[PDB]
Amino acid sequence: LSSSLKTCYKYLNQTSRSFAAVIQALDGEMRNAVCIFALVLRALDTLEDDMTISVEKKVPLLHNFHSFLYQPDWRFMESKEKDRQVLEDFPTISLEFRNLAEKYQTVIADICRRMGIGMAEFLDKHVTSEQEWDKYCHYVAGLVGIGLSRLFSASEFEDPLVGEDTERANSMGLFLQKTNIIRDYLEDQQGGREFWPQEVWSRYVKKLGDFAKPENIDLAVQCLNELITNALHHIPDVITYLSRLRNQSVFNFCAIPQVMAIATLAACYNNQQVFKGAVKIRKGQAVTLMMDATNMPAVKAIIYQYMEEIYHRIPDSDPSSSKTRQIISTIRTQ
Ligand SMILES: CC(C)=CCC/C(C)=C\CC/C(C)=C\[C@@H]1[C@@H](COP(=O)(O)OP(=O)(O)O)[C@]1(C)CC/C=C(\C)CCC=C(C)C
Ligand SMILES: [Mn+2]
Ligand SMILES: [Mn+2]
Ligand SMILES: [Mn+2]
């Protein structure tokens, strides 16, 4: 490997810890392509997340980010985010980007372009409806699934269908992102960011921050269960998507994060502790189970086990209880 590509893998291990291992195991050309895609996405997210950058300054950066990939000299030296190194040494990443086959470059730049436009749109608004929640998730995560899928198809390790079924790929991304947002209530509230959809939480409290108040814990947990229930609706699509993958390394790459997210939602379900910080995800059980789960029947058994865990904890009085049971029964029979 070149020194620049070695550096890129260094950055991948620092900035995308949960994905680094499955990425490095990808077959052939997919490995570098996905590594670089992850790094450019990390840089773009680091811009989006940085609240020290004014909206006025941020908007052109997000819009023009895709074009920076083709400017050998471009870097950004003003980030105060923890992953700023990928911005400050962007030339190393964009160099390796321009080393990828054109077919991968085209997908990556297209997704960066579309993601930047969408991220910019949300700088001036909160998330209101459930549809707006889906829209925000599409821009920051669904498009990643779509991009990854198009990379798989372009590589020819997977069929054209994988890249073409953008709804299924979108769902894979939405599932991870909704899980992240649900899980990260308190961290986000403390950093002054709000992602829970207003049309949902405003049925419980007047301000999203009110869920951090001990007196409101029961309403907070109802809302939590409602949002989890919404996220579970993506699982049929995740099963459909995973069922089509032919290449082992791709399957592992796609399946592992989805199972980790499922385990996270199960740990979050009906759990007051979400409102007090990080929940013990029983990450370990999931990681251990996935070692052996290299095929659809094994993946399905794990999903069913986590769904059964949620199901037997559904409170009778929970306003979402009927819906939660309904989606779990759908998942079980897919
Ligand atoms: C390319 C690769 C492996 C990883 C990319 C991750 C990187 C480095 C940057 C992207 C940052 C953005 C914009 C969104 C979220 C990633 C975590 O960011 P984070 O900072 O925690 O969230 P936030 O800022 O909202 O708090 C996220 C969860 C996207 C996950 C979607 C996937 C993986 C598609 C699955 C679909 C199939 C596989 C069909
Ligand atoms: Mn972000
Ligand atoms: Mn982020
Ligand atoms: Mn988050």
UniProtKB/Swiss-Prot annotation:
Associated disease: Squalene synthase deficiency: An autosomal recessive disorder characterized by profound developmental delay, brain abnormalities, 2/3 syndactyly of the toes, facial dysmorphisms, low total and LDL-cholesterol, and abnormal urine organic acids.
Entry keyword set: Cholesterol biosynthesis, Cholesterol metabolism, Endoplasmic reticulum, Lipid biosynthesis, Lipid metabolism, Magnesium, Membrane, Metal-binding, Multifunctional enzyme, NAD, NADP, Steroid biosynthesis, Steroid metabolism, Sterol biosynthesis, Sterol metabolism, Transferase, Transmembrane, Transmembrane helix
Positions that bind NADP(+): R17, R42, R183, K280, R282
Outcome of mutating K10R: Influences plasma cholesterol levels; associated with increased total cholesterol and non-high-density lipoprotein cholesterol
Main location: endoplasmic reticulum
Residues the record lists as binding Mg(2+): D45, E48, D49
Similarity comment: Belongs to the phytoene/squalene synthase family.
Broad EC category: transferase
GO BP, sorted A to Z: cholesterol biosynthetic process; farnesyl diphosphate metabolic process; steroid biosynthetic process
Catalytic activity: 2 (2E,6E)-farnesyl diphosphate + NADPH + H(+) = squalene + 2 diphosphate + NADP(+); 2 (2E,6E)-farnesyl diphosphate + NADH + H(+) = squalene + 2 diphosphate + NAD(+); 2 (2E,6E)-farnesyl diphosphate = presqualene diphosphate + diphosphate; presqualene diphosphate + NADH + H(+) = squalene + diphosphate + NAD(+)
Membrane topology: Multi-pass membrane protein
One cellular component term from this protein's GO annotations in UniProt: endoplasmic reticulum
Protein known as: Squalene synthase
Origin species: Homo sapiens (Human)
GO molecular function: metal ion binding; squalene synthase [NAD(P)H] activity
Cofactors: Mg(2+)
Tissues expressing the protein: Widely expressed.
Pathway field: Terpene metabolism; lanosterol biosynthesis; lanosterol from farnesyl diphosphate: step 1/3
Residues of the full protein shown: 36 to 369 of 417
Described purpose of this protein according to its UniProt entry: Catalyzes the condensation of 2 farnesyl pyrophosphate (FPP) moieties to form squalene. Proceeds in two distinct steps. In the first half-reaction, two molecules of FPP react to form the stable presqualene diphosphate intermediate (PSQPP), with concomitant release of a proton and a molecule of inorganic diphosphate. In the second half-reaction, PSQPP undergoes heterolysis, isomerization, and reduction with NADPH or NADH to form squalene. It is the first committed enzyme of the sterol biosynthesis pathway.
